[PDB]
């Protein structure tokens, strides 16, 4: 009753890098028309954007409904952002889907967006100051990356998922070394190109066509990892060797009832069997994924064994071991094409965007059953299992 | 089969008033807190907080969940916030109201939360500005008060309605006394009583108490009515006295099954009959509510008439003129007990704010079927039936 | 040798009050216009202006040649800032007088001047901040009140003196409340008339003149100077009520030789008979005053007894107390109208401020005999005898 | 009377190149070291240090003291900063030529030190901005570079000249292209190697030395200039070619008596025979060199022609070659070994890097008698000479 007829992503950029000076809602127009044109769909077709972005601070009113106009939908259509941290990305297609299961919507372009680049720092100014120095605040560490409760950097909680599931620094650089290796594999191999839909900075001194994913290191080893100095805790594990970057990027997905697809001789990626959202200890985030996971089997009703294809979030390698370690599924059948250590972690969009890697991946082998999910900071984590038709 | 258990709001606050060093969430746990004890439902039963937040850059993590975990519901449960603009308040609701239709919830708290006083200035520094002077920008008027696509305020836009529904200087002055008038009298009369849970702004030197909406003018005089000059065109129809304000508020409903209140032996304030959301020409942004409002009726089968209350937020004094002429709903029955030119407009809690309102004259006076409706920046409006039972 | 023919100083003004919003170079030229009225010296006769002013962050290119100009100093003279903080003002005329010593000049303005509340917040911000908070500095706090190499106040450095000269607070309170009443009793008796120039606050809504001490504490009493909080150290003994305040103002004196004020027929205010400066530790920069007071004397080829009248500007009463002990001269000769704990500390004019003071007080009691001192952050002292003519 | 004993300066580094994140008192540091050990001379003996400085905000207090503190020079002796614009490092010298000639001191570090890649921006916050965007001002510019009574850059000023001498845009590039390529010319033939002091850059990964001009084109073309667009003035003829650049520098002068330099056995690089200062329309600042070289000549009582070389700061080559058609002097003996154009124009170290570049050349080819000039925004000129001993 509800399926995802296409679906694509920008590559993602490097902190500073191919879209240092490029608004959020110019990757998501982009990644707009690119669903539209993949799944033969018209933009005066779509209902509704749905767009999860977690750093909008700055960017001008509403960037969902700035992204859809860009990218060509009709002002009759409506359009909006959503908050769930880097679960949004994902959430948002679960928001996209229900609007259709309620039958509010036909046709709804969902997914994410975030410019970690371009997030500005801030400061409250309206009272004035009288005298003293004050701080100016960087939304992207206060707003993305530090717990709201306890004061410190999400890595930190990667620093307790970690010392709680006695994962070895050496373990999670191991499992750190994988996903590079896993993701160059794949980059050179055209895995990505399918899903990847270039975008063109524009430049006064020339046009740039951005198409690859360029925080992937080639020739990641072992060695190297360890050679990495602690990033959070002064004597900790976790290090910008074993933990996600910052990027920038976007990603989405069309959304239709499987009896309208049928009518427009679409081929669906997949239709949405389930999805859950659940609640732990925000100083132990990672481990989100697990609750999040085990009840979007359970919904769908399907086995940690039966399912074949599956993408988790690489927040921190901490995290990640822990989250496998525990739901015991096939090491062979995660991140297959490497996870977010290797493709970057923007955020906002890492929802939709570990989803079309997913679904990309599931129709070139032919997996029917899947699973994508994140954890999420405040102690968090989104589910969703997909089923190829 | 979708109700509203119960509602509570903070008093709308002024701009740098009573609110004016309290953070959005501080204002949205109380407000949660309040409609768990109005119902009777315990913050451990609570699925999802969902609250709509234009505005909150520099916050920190994900409000939303600031506010429930504040408020006591447990980590167990699932927030997030949302962005549709002036739409976001009562967007949430629509929101909170899918989640359970689509058997994916049980109880939901949604509402919108703003605080317009604690928004912050903000630049993009990261690539550091190498020579020159820039802007250091305030995010309450840049994401909150500015169209993306032409750049000037939601008063030009209002501007462009009055002009294009011939709107005179007097006209709008008129609505602007009559809307304050009745807040002046509604207020008094203690009808804002049961809406309003009184909210504790926590000082150093001195607790203060706040349950009044400080924002409603005292015997608006009609003369100084016509004395103010226009805000926003040199020579324009839209000024202060006849425009909306900036102010600070959170406001919300807990939504549950109609079987599900059964059982409790609650008395709903409502079900939810239908809602939506429809676009409209960016510059003419406040005729909003026009084709939200007739879609929202459509769906419910009901016509204009048929409606025994009505709440058209009060954005500006043309939109507002606007919407009731076109839709012929009897002005009379519209915002009763007053408006956003005279309680306030907290953006992202606005939404919510008049679904309070609502809820509680239509107890009071013993109301079947009403309506809220908004106008949203870049062009969209917003709009949901209430039948009482 | 060189005598100072006439000196004028605006009010001094507290912080963020009467000349909040007024630029120093504004202030400056008032004095400039008086000092010139005074002697009856044209602005065309004028060949440099020489001002003192420790922050002029913000107020355009070397302000004391904008307050030249809109004195109409002729675009042909030449003008010049200098910064040897609190010392500014009074070094500023020691240079003055060196100019007509050598030759190069035959008439000077000189003084100081100072907008504390004008000083801005500032960052640098062109390498750009690539990720984490940032503070905005007060300049104010920064660049003229912070020890550049022990990193704490001037008020630590008043703590350290207390200490080590065993200066009690009771004692520190009690020089601090005489400073007030003595400023307050020649306020009354209008004793600070003379040496006062008005200036005129334009405004839209009315000009205001400001001709009297605003920072002046009238009735000040020893009970509530003893009941406020240490300002620097948790255990500390200075305080807001025993240091000097912040401030904004102008001071300055119109030199030329003895023999150009003859052939003029001016009867000079004094005779510049030597001046000194000297340094000492940054930790105790506050016993400056020391080694330059009797530099100067020993320049003059006068004892301490020698001398008439004294103005020794308070920093703060620690050192005040300290230098008048380490000294011995009688303090019924010190500061007889009071001083900066009562009049204003603006850091920059006030070593022109208390030259005035002086100059306007010796011939009023016909004192042959003067010195004025004040010491210097980062551990400096100046000085300078004034002989009657 | 007073004599140079020694001199040094450090590279000047480009805007945001080997200085970027250097403050001026360390640049400083470094060039008072740099003296002393020059001379024979043991910080001990300083008594005091002079140090024009246009751009100190955020430094903290007294970057001057800082400077002396750090070479060594004994907390006993005293510093202070000055401002004369760009006339500030050769002003600097001239005053503190006089401390010596009035007998209040013996031994003098005078010069200029300026980072302009460090100046920062800032704005007025004690107020409080109420609501909306407001300006950092960048400081550099405004402070630095900006007409205080006419609102332009001082490269206005250089259009107001070329069209009042009438000057052709080849013929400032001419003279650009000419100050590169004798700059490149004395780089390359080590001309530069006895003037500099080496700079280490303190680097986390690695400390840099610094001791080659960075700025100085190598193989400049014509063609390129001829190609540039104007800067300042769409129809204008001064573009970033024919403009002195932005730039981090410092220098400075050793100086005592011709007597105490005998006693010590020192061979100093020269006399200083006479200075001058004089003012000129602010509109047409550039030709301030004019009147005042011609006043320094009269001082020393020596003609034009009298002269065997010239340094004349090269602010722009408009204003350079007005200055050279209106003087009349040889321009083979004006800026032999280029100047500011291509060298670089750190503001208020440039008269003091004139002042090297001068004595060094004087050395070196046996010329008897030199004037170093320099162009001071707000209308003025500042010009010494120097003789051989
Ligand atoms: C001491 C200092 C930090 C205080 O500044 P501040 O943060 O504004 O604190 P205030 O000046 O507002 O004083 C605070 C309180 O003490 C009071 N107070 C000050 N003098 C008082 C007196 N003589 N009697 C009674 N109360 C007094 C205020 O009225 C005030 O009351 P409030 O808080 O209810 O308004 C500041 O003035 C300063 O730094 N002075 C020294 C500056 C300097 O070093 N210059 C160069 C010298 S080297
Ligand atoms: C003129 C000025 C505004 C330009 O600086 P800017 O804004 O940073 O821009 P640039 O310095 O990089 O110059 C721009 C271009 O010309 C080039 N350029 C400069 N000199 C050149 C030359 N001699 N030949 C060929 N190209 C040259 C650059 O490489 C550049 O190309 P790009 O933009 O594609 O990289 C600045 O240097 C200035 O204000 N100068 C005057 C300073 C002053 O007034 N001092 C005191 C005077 S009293
Ligand atoms: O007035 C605005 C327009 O109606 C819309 O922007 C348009 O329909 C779409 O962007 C598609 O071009
Ligand atoms: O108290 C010590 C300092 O002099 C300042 O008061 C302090 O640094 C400000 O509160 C913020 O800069
Ligand atoms: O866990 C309970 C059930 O087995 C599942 O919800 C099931 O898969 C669905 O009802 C669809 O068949
Ligand atoms: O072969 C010539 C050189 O490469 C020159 O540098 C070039 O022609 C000019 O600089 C163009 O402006
Ligand atoms: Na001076």
């Known amino acids: 009753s509800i399926v995802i007829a296409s679906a694509a992503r920008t590559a993602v950029g490097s902190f500073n890098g191919a879209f240092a000076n490029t608004p959020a809602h110019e990757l ?87 410019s970690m680049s371009m997030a500005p720092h801030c400061a409250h100014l309206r009272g004035g100051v009288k005298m003293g120095d004050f701080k100016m605040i960087d939304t992207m560490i206060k707003d993305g990356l530090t717990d709201a409760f306890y004061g410190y950097h999400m890595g930190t909680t990667a620093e307790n998922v970690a010392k709680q599931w006695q994962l070895s620094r050496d373990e999670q650089d191991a499992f750190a ?43 990641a080893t072992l060695d190297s990892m360890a050679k990495l100095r602690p990033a959070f805790d002064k004597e900790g594990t976790v290090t910008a060797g074993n933990a996600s970057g910052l990027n920038d990027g976007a990603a989405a997905a069309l959304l239709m009832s499987e009896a309208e697809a049928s009518r427009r001789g679409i081929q669906p990626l997949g239709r949405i069997v389930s999805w859950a959202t659940v609640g732990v200890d925000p100083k132990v985030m990672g481990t989100g994924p697990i609750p999040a996971s085990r009840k979007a089997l359970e919904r769908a009703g399907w086995k940690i064994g039966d399912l074949d294809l599956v993408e988790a979030n690489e927040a921190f390698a901490a995290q990640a071991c822990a989250v496998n370690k525990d739901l015991g599924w096939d090491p062979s059948i995660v991140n297959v094409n ?39 900071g405040g102690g968090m984590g989104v589910a969703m299992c997909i089923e190829s038709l």
Chains 1, 2, 3, 4 share one sequence.
């Open 28 to 114: 998501g127009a982009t990644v707009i028309s690119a669903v539209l044109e993949r799944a033969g769909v018209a933009a005066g077709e779509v209902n509704e954007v749905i767009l999860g972005q977690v750093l909008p601070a700055g960017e001008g009113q509403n960037p969902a409904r700035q992204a859809a106009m860009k990218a060509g939908v009709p002002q009759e259509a409506t359009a909006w952002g959503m908050n769930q941290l880097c679960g949004s990305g994902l959430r948002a297609v679960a928001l996209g889907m229900q609007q259709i299961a309620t039958g509010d919507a036909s046709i709804i372009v969902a997914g994410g967006m975030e």
């Open 338 to 376: 490497g996870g977010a250590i290797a493709i970057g972690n923007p955020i906002g969009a890492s929802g939709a965007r570990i989803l079309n890697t997913l679904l990309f991946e599931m129709k070139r082998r032919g997996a029917r059953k899947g699973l994508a999910t994140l954890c999420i």
């Open 177 to 219: 070394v994988a996903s590079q290796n896993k993701a160059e594999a794949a980059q050179k191999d055209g895995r990505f190109k399918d899903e990847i839909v270039p975008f063109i900075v524009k430049g006064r001194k020339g046009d740039i066509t951005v198409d690859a994913d360029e925080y992937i290191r080639h020739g």
